[PDB]
Design a protein around this ligand. Structure first.
Ligand SMILES: [Mg+2]
Ligand SMILES: [Mg+2]
Ligand SMILES: [Mg+2]
Ligand SMILES: [Mg+2]
Ligand SMILES: [Mg+2]
Ligand SMILES: [Mg+2]
Ligand SMILES: [Mg+2]
Ligand SMILES: [Mg+2]
Ligand SMILES: [Mg+2]
Ligand SMILES: [Mg+2]
Ligand SMILES: [Mg+2]
Ligand SMILES: [Mg+2]
Ligand SMILES: [Mg+2]
Ligand SMILES: [Mg+2]
Ligand SMILES: [Mg+2]
Ligand SMILES: [Mg+2]
Ligand SMILES: [Mg+2]
Ligand SMILES: [Mg+2]
Ligand SMILES: [Mg+2]
Ligand SMILES: [Mg+2]
Ligand SMILES: [Zn+2]
Ligand SMILES: [Zn+2]
Lengths: 78, 136, 184, 66, 50
RNA sequence: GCGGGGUGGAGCAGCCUGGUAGCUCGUCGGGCUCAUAACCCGAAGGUCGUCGGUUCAAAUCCGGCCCCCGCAACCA
RNA sequence: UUUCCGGUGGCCAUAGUGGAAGGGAAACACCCGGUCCCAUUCCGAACCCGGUCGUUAAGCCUUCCAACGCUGAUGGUACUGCACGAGGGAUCGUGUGGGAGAGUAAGACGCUGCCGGAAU
RNA sequence: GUCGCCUCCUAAAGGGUAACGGAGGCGCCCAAAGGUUCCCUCAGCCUGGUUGGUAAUCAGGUGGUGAGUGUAAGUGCACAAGGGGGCUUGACUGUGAGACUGACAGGUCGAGCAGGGACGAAAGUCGGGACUAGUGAUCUGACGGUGGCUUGUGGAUGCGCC
């Protein structure tokens, strides 16, 4: 008959933004899982080995632009 | 028979056949033309039959434009076989026609014989079509 | 030693005055002058052995007076039979006093003793006031020896001048003095 | 300049065997330069050859017959 | 087989502190590294075991 | 469908892998003979079925295609 | 206080690209050297050092030019959540909310903060 | 024919989503292709130039990403994560606030701290590699270290821990 040379696929990795704008986060809380820097680390946000953006401090998450880059900041809580 | 030299992917999903014509709803090259009033798939064999009819009727004068191109491949399941075992091999090449799309254009021919040639062509197409002009 | 070269002195006085008078530059620092001299040699038959590169290095070092930059192959090519990163050419950049005295030596000594020398074409400018030409043979530089050269090699000589246009570049290099025929 | 990578390069007299002596600088090891011909000595542009050609095809005819 | 697992032991307290991989063909001889030896409590020279 | 094969004029090597295409016969030129066959001495001869890709580089690696084979195409 | 200019940010083309004209008081710059720290996978070109003569030609600065590019409504259309409807069928229509892309008028030869400079 | 892992599409603008659906990869590699610090900008095109040709090396002009990235693809990266030089071993030991993601086993990220280092004038960065595949639970056995236990005591032997 016939057969397919396809049928392989990788497991779902579950990327994407995990905390949206204004959401209160704790220090170290993961903000976005991603491959490559679609979002760059902004103020109060660190970037991990697999390009995960996480919170360096408590506060509220905001998405903005720092110079020419899309960045994610954590504004310290009032 | 119009067949593309190559395509990126030979096995493709069926083209969307919803909606009106995205573009190319107006004459761009010739004086008269065929405008499809209904959507559908237009195979290269049908395109060739219509083009042969128009050219043969208009004899030596005038020039014909084929606005659409059958660049979408259609696979066919292997005959007499149960469902499954992957997608088939491309067997037909079609163009995605939507209402209002200008299929063929003609220029350099008097209006009456142009109309008759367009009638000959339209009787070979699988969807309803009409003769259009630049308001004369 | 400390002495401003003959060719540099001639350039400054005679050539700067001549250009100022017969091009009418409205600004004093617009008279063109030699910017640099580049001595290249592509020794592409070095993909099979290294001795040819060593000989080329020795020859260019003796001719110019400084160690050459050895360029490795940017990309490998099978029909030229060169791999990636192999040394296939060497070049020297001369500026200032070394530039002036090498140019003086070349013009006064070397190309005069080219076999059946007929001069250099005036139509070998890049189109921006810079003039590059080629020597098919090397030992004609009498600053090197004669009976120890591994093989005959050639080279490319490029004069890069601060000249905006081809005509004024030609005027500058003529005033400096080249053998310029009236042929293509 | 980098020390130890460049050749010996010192004051150098050149004599062209045509009445020309000059004081350039080169790498001529333990010695100077004894040229065979100079620029102002070469027969190229000092104008001492003027070969052009010998195109008198008829001129040859009356040379050997006229 | 071509990139075997090599074990670095400190040359002071002969303790197999680390394990890593070499190329055997690109690095045929035993490899020398300065790593932290927990027993020696400092950075000591580490050598591949024989 | 599975697997193999296509290289001078013919029949066959070169395919783990890239870089140097070989043997036998035949073709062609010269000897030997009265002449032919045989034999002796020299030479040419295939850019590798085709399209495309990989790669610095393809007879060799990969895919499509064409040709030739073999096998399978079963249970009621 | 103002004007002009040099640095250093912010917005990241409404700022760019290209063309034209003009300017240097401080300043910037090219420029002049390489002795000295230092430097070139060769080269005092660059980096670095020493000068500020020369020069506004260029960078830089000012004015001008919608020319390429950029920005860009309103209205309409596509699509669409929900609720229905019509065709033999591809598919299409309506109600009620949302509503582009393109295109059109147009905008635009940048805006703004701090520090320093020379003058007022 | 397929069975685990990775990338894309299908997948309907979070995540997830099946088929013997459509495309490809993986079972490595690198002592630098890791760390750090400083420096650099490509491909293409045009012109001129010994050998030299479309294309080697050189010069000028142009050119912002179309080159490049150890390896698929996507997301990234010209601020370079791309190219080069110097010095190095953090391809660390003891840790992990706080999260991500799975029915679970599990998979992933991680600030801060101490020890002891590398680099940098410093600010600082470094718990392998631009990112995501390059992998196998438990059992049983093995080697190295440690010396917790050892059936009367001391050894031995065996076991435990790492
Ligand atoms: Mg990392
Ligand atoms: Mg990692
Ligand atoms: Mg259009
Ligand atoms: Mg039976
Ligand atoms: Mg608009
Ligand atoms: Mg709009
Ligand atoms: Mg999704
Ligand atoms: Mg959805
Ligand atoms: Mg399901
Ligand atoms: Mg790098
Ligand atoms: Mg390790
Ligand atoms: Mg925790
Ligand atoms: Mg994973
Ligand atoms: Mg520390
Ligand atoms: Mg230090
Ligand atoms: Mg890497
Ligand atoms: Mg790196
Ligand atoms: Mg068991
Ligand atoms: Mg007892
Ligand atoms: Mg431990
Ligand atoms: Zn002479
Ligand atoms: Zn130790």
């Amino acid at each position: 008959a016939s057969s397919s040379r396809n049928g392989r696929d990788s497991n779902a990795q579950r990327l994407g933004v995990k905390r949206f704008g204004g959401q209160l986060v704790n220090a170290g809380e993961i903000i976005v899982r991603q491959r490559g820097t679609h979002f760059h680390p902004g103020d109060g946000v660190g970037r991990g080995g697999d390009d995960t953006l996480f919170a360096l401090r408590d506060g509220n998450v905001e998405f903005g632009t720092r110079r020419g880059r899309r960045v994610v900041n954590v504004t310290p809580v009032e | 028979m119009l067949i593309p030299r190559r395509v990126k992917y030979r096995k493709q999903h069926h083209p969307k056949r919803t909606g009106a014509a995205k573009g190319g709803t107006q004459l761009a090259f010739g004086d008269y033309g065929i405008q499809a009033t209904e959507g559908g798939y237009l195979t290269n064999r049908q395109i060739e039959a219509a083009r042969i009819a128009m050219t043969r009727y208009i004899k030596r004068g005038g020039k014909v434009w084929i606005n659409v191109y059958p660049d979408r491949p259609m696979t066919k399941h292997p005959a007499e076989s149960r469902m499954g075992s992957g997608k088939g091999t491309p067997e037909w090449w079609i163009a995605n026609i939507k209402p209002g799309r200008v299929l063929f254009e003609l220029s350099g021919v008097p209006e009456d014989v142009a109309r008759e040639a367009m009638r000959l062509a339209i009787h070979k197409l699988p969807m309803k079509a009409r003769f259009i002009s630049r308001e004369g | 030693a400390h002495e401003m070269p003959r060719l540099k002195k001639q350039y400054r006085e005679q050539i700067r005055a001549a250009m100022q008078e017969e091009f009418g530059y409205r600004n004093p620092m617009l008279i063109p002058g030699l910017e640099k001299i580049v001595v290249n040699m592509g020794v592409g038959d070095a993909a099979h052995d290294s001795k040819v590169m060593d000989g080329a290095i020795r020859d260019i070092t003796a001719i110019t007076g400084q160690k050459p930059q050895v360029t490795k192959a940017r990309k490998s090519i099978a029909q030229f039979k060169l791999r990636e990163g192999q040394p296939i050419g060497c070049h020297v950049t001369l500026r200032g006093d070394r530039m002036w005295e090498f140019a003086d030596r070349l013009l006064t000594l070397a190309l005069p003793r080219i076999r059946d020398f007929r001069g250099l074409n005036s139509n070998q400018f890049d189109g921006k006031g810079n003039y590059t030409f080629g020597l098919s043979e090397q030992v004609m530089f009498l600053e090197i020896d004669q009976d120890k050269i591994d093989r005959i090699r050639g080279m490319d000589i490029t004069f890069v001048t601060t000249a905006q246009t081809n005509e004024e570049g030609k005027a500058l290099l003529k005033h400096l003095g080249f053998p310029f025929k009236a042929k293509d | 300049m980098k020390q130890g990578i460049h050749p010996d390069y010192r004051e150098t007299t050149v004599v062209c065997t045509c009445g020309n002596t000059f004081t350039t600088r080169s790498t001529s090891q333990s010695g100077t330069l004894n040229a065979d011909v100079c620029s102002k000595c070469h027969p190229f542009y000092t104008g001492k050859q003027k070969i052009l050609d010998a195109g008198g095809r008829v001129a040859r005819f009356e040379r050997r017959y006229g | 087989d071509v990139r075997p697992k090599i074990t670095l032991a400190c040359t002071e307290c002969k303790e197999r502190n680390y394990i890593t991989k070499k190329n055997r063909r690109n690095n045929p001889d035993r490899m020398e590294m300065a790593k932290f030896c927990p027993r020696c409590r400092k950075h000591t020279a580490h050598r591949e075991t024989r």
